[PDB]
């Protein structure tokens, strides 16, 4: 068994599970973390080589499956239920499962409990909140407005979506970027900027710096950012994203998944390592010890991890969020929407103009 997993994940822990398997089966298990493995896999797998198992964000696997690089996994009915229903929706291509969900990540609302003990449950009340805070020389909310990943939660709340999903299949042509839901969300976002509750030039570093030094009461970010806030010693909380028009914000969900190489002769063997040795309380903890997985797809262990409210919030937002389409056309989406939001935010284009371009640019029709 040869496995590829990113170097920023707890590969030492996954290797301990490897040691276990070997000592509990005999087959040796090597866990590598080559540089730029997500690009190396599709090249090496096209020659019938590569690892037996590959760990990476699900969004990449749809491209892999399309090239027949991934073997279809066959999780029994009983196993499916061990994991959260929505996580399986992230590892399907053409309705067929091509990977095992491992961990789950999504944006959450991060807030300063000293400046804002009562974080907003709705987007609509943030303007009023910012008005109160601006008297104290502070702002209600600062977050990266440069990347669609961060602004999509709001834009999508009222019915926006990248590509239509159903039966483990995305419709390249059905794009929900310029629908009434998206226009309502982006309009509210632009109005926050127009009324100067936020600045159109706010990016990741600016928002991060502002929150960690207590200049803004809220920000939007993922589990990766927590470590920098801990060092800032700001008394922060992590909670559910605000609703828009009675709808939950829909952050994109990233699911660290494990695929089986189509060229591997150890398909059923890899299935036993993932289902019976990695995807257990013991397996996931062995990895989590080396480097925190955040929220996990396995119900049993997630319920233990969720004792940390920050992880609990991550899962909650993920369950309410939009699974990131795993299809290559998503590159077009990121590209087009990134320009539309920046343009709508700067007044360079109107909301309608910006999203129409994005709709077309993403490969859809008005």
Partner 1 sequence: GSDLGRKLLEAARAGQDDECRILMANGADVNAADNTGTTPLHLAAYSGHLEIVECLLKHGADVDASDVFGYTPLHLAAYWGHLEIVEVLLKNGADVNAMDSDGMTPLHLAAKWGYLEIVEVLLKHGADVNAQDKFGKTPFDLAIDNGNEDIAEVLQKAAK
As measured in angstroms, the least distance from the Cβ of 45 to partner 1 is 47
Contact 145, 345 (CB under 8 A): yes
b/e map of 333-348 (b: 16 or more CB within 10 Å)? beebbbbbbbbbbeee
- What the block records as the tokens of 98 is 């091509």
As measured in angstroms, the least distance from the Cβ of 54 to partner 1 is 45
Stretch that binds partner 1, among 18-26, 75-83, 318-326, 347-355 (CB under 8 A): 347-355
Decide: is 131 part of the binding site for partner 1 (CB under 8 A): yes
Query: Which residues does residue 165 pair with via DSSP β-bridges, in sequence order?
Result: 170
Contact 179, 235 (CB under 8 A): no
Collapsing DSSP states into helix, strand and coil, what is residue 257?
Answer: strand
Stretch that binds partner 1, among 91-99, 148-156, 187-195, 323-331 (CB under 8 A): 187-195
Could you give the string, one character per residue 199-238, with x where binding to partner 1 holds by CB under 8 A and - elsewhere? Answer: -x--------------------------------------
- CA dist 132 and 6 (Å) reads 44
As measured in angstroms, the least distance from the Cβ of 84 to partner 1 is 39
Stretch that binds partner 1, among 63-71, 89-97, 324-332, 344-352 (CB under 8 A): 344-352
CA distances from 188 to 125, 239, 253 (A): 12, 21, 23
Decide: is 122 part of the binding site for partner 1 (CB under 8 A): no
- CA dist 237 and 111 (Å) reads 5
Decide: is 339 part of the binding site for partner 1 (CB under 8 A): no
Q: For partner 1, which is the closer residue by CB, 228 or 350?
A: 350
As measured in angstroms, the least distance from the Cβ of 96 to partner 1 is 45
Contact 200, 346 (CB under 8 A): yes
Q: For partner 1, which is the closer residue by CB, 46 or 128?
A: 128
- Return all residues near 341 (Cβ < 8 A) that are at least 6 apart: 145, 148, 151, 155, 186, 189, 354
As measured in angstroms, the least distance from the Cβ of 184 to partner 1 is 11
Q: For partner 1, which is the closer residue by CB, 195 or 235?
A: 195
Q: Distance of alpha carbon 153 from its chain centroid, rounded?
A: 11
Residues contributing to the site for partner 1 (CB under 8 A): 128, 131, 190, 194-196, 200, 346-348, 350
């Amino acid at each position: 068994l040869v496995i590829w997993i990113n170097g920023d994940k707890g590969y030492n822990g996954l290797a301990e599970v490897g040691k276990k398997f070997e000592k509990d089966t005999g087959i040796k298990v090597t866990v590598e973390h080559p540089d730029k493995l997500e690009e190396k896999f599709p090249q090496v797998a096209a020659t019938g080589d590569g690892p037996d198992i590959i760990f990476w964000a699900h969004d990449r696997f749809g491209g892999y499956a399309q090239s027949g690089l991934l073997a279809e996994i066959t999780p029994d009915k009983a196993f499916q239920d061990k994991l959260y229903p929505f996580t399986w929706d992230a590892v399907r291509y053409n309705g067929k499962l091509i990977a095992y969900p491992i961990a789950v990540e999504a944006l959450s609302l991060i807030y300063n409990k000293d400046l804002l003990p009562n974080p907003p449950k709705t987007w609509e009340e943030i303007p009023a909140l910012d008005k109160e805070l601006k008297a104290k020389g502070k702002s209600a909310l600062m977050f990266n407005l440069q990347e669609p990943y961060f602004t999509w939660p709001l834009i999508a709340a009222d019915g926006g979506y990248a590509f239509k999903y159903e039966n483990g299949k995305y419709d390249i042509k059905d794009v929900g970027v310029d629908n009434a839901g998206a226009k309502a969300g982006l309009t509210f976002l632009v109005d926050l900027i127009k009324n100067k509750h936020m600045n159109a030039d706010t990016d990741y570093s600016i928002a991060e710096a502002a929150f960690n030094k207590g200049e803004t009461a809220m920000t939007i970010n993922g589990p990766w950012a927590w470590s920098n806030i801990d060092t800032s010693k700001v008394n922060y909380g992590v909670t559910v994203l605000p609703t828009f028009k009675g709808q939950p914000s829909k952050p994109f969900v990233g699911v660290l998944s494990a695929g089986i190489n189509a060229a591997s002769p150890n398909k059923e063997l890899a299935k036993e390592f993932l289902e019976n040795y990695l995807l257990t309380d013991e397996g996931l903890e062995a990895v989590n010890k080396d480097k925190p997985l955040g929220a996990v797809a396995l119900k049993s262990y997630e319920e233990e991890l969720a004792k940390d409210p920050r992880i609990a919030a991550t899962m909650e937002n993920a369950q309410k969020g939009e699974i990131m389409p795993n299809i290559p056309q998503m590159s077009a989406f990121w590209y087009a929407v990134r320009t539309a939001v920046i343009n709508a935010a700067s007044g360079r284009q109107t909301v309608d103009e910006a999203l129409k371009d994005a709709q077309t640019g993403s490969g859809g029709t008005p």
